[PDB]
Amino acid sequence: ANSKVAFSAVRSTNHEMSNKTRIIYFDQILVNVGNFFTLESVFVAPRKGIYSFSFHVIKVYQSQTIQVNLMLNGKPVISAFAGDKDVTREAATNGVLLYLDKEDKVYLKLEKGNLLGGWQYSTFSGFLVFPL
Amino acid sequence: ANSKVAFSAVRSTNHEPSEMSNKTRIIYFDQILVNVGNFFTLESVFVAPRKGIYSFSFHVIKVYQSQTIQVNLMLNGKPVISAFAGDKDVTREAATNGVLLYLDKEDKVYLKLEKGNLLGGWQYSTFSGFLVFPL
Amino acid sequence: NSKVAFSAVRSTNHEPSEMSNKTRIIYFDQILVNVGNFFTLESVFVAPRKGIYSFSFHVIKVYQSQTIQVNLMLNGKPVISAFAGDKDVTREAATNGVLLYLDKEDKVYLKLEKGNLLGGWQYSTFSGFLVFPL
Numbered sequence A: 001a002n003s004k005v006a007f008s009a010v011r012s013t014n015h016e017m018s019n020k021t022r023i024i025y026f027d028q029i030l031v032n033v034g035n036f037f038t039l040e041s042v043f044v045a046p047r048k049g050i051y052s053f054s055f056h057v058i059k060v061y062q063s064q065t066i067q068v069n070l071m072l073n074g075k076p077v078i079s080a081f082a083g084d085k086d087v088t089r090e091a092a093t094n095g096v097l098l099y100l101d102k103e104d105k106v107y108l109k110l111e112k113g114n115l116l117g118g119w120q121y122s123t124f125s126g127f128l129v130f131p132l
Numbered sequence B: 001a002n003s004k005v006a007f008s009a010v011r012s013t014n015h016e017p018s019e020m021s022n023k024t025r026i027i028y029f030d031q032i033l034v035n036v037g038n039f040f041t042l043e044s045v046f047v048a049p050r051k052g053i054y055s056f057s058f059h060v061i062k063v064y065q066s067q068t069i070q071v072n073l074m075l076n077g078k079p080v081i082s083a084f085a086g087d088k089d090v091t092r093e094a095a096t097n098g099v100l101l102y103l104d105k106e107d108k109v110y111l112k113l114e115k116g117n118l119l120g121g122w123q124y125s126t127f128s129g130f131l132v133f134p135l
Numbered sequence C: 001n002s003k004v005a006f007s008a009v010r011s012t013n014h015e016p017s018e019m020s021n022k023t024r025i026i027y028f029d030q031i032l033v034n035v036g037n038f039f040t041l042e043s044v045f046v047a048p049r050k051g052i053y054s055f056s057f058h059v060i061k062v063y064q065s066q067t068i069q070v071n072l073m074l075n076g077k078p079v080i081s082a083f084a085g086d087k088d089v090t091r092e093a094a095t096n097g098v099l100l101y102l103d104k105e106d107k108v109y110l111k112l113e114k115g116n117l118l119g120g121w122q123y124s125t126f127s128g129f130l131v132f133p134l
């Protein structure tokens, strides 16, 4: 039970972010065991452990560049990029394992760019690999 | 019981799609690296043995030039996530994505070539997945 | 060792070592996770026990003029490949991922099969974990 933690979220075409935080949100929740993925955007770790994270953020409008940072408690840990102005729906993708303690916050930030065209079909997933 | 489940497959040649695959549009992988539980069948379809959360990932590599491709991860005949590879005039291009799904027993997960033809083959393409935890 | 995982990042834009140029092994300086310490300082993973392991990588470059091919290697042999390059963009990633059956002491690592890492490979990642022992 308490060792079972996972979330998976997708950006659809729903039409329900700030220049400060620039948090990328995912409206369609596919998995949320434990309900620790909150506000369509932020994962809050329930316990100390190793967690897997992966994401694909779609650069839809072709002539733009984006940079996406995976954030841990307000600080960047990994980065992804998409800036091929010949390509439509190019993914800025990366993944990582992290050592998290209880109440650690992990989310995606649009560090650079504007996601012109929207970011439909973008994905963001995470799960507890094992507790420590 | 059936708590260890995982598969992993790769397209090892540049051979063209089979005549059957042109009518189902289901992308298949001939080289099976992992198939614990033997739940990955027909070199293409994963059948969930039990209720739980399952991870999936895929990298479909197209050559130049098959037309712009769209790959959907399918769950019981309906698309869940999609990836795109529009040509950037290079020798090879990749349509990639991954996701966690809540699956029930006998649920079927597979890859569909929604758009495009994969002319020139899809060598080096990969498709993987595993049970994260039963539910 | 039921709990085995590593995750590593290339944190700088520094050129590869002369040794690295010789071995073609892509190395990572920043280790975020290394439970069991089976990911060595030479950026090679040594499987502690028989089991199914997950591996993912992203090799990111700022200079993409020439083609790069990255192979995931298992005891000196390629298992999967990733391609990038021959482009002029901000940053591009050669990426792929796979599950592998490993026997104990099997060696898994990234080799630059084609191309170079002129300009550095900052922000590149390489991760792996034991899904379950067999």
Ligand SMILES: *[C@@H]1O[C@H](CO)[C@@H](O)[C@H](O)[C@H]1NC(C)=O
Pocket: C015, C016, C017, C018, C021, C116, C117, C118, C119
């Ligand atoms: C290794 O090769 C790269 C690519 O040509 C080059 O930039 C780098 O300077 C080489 N390393 C050394 C120590 O010369």
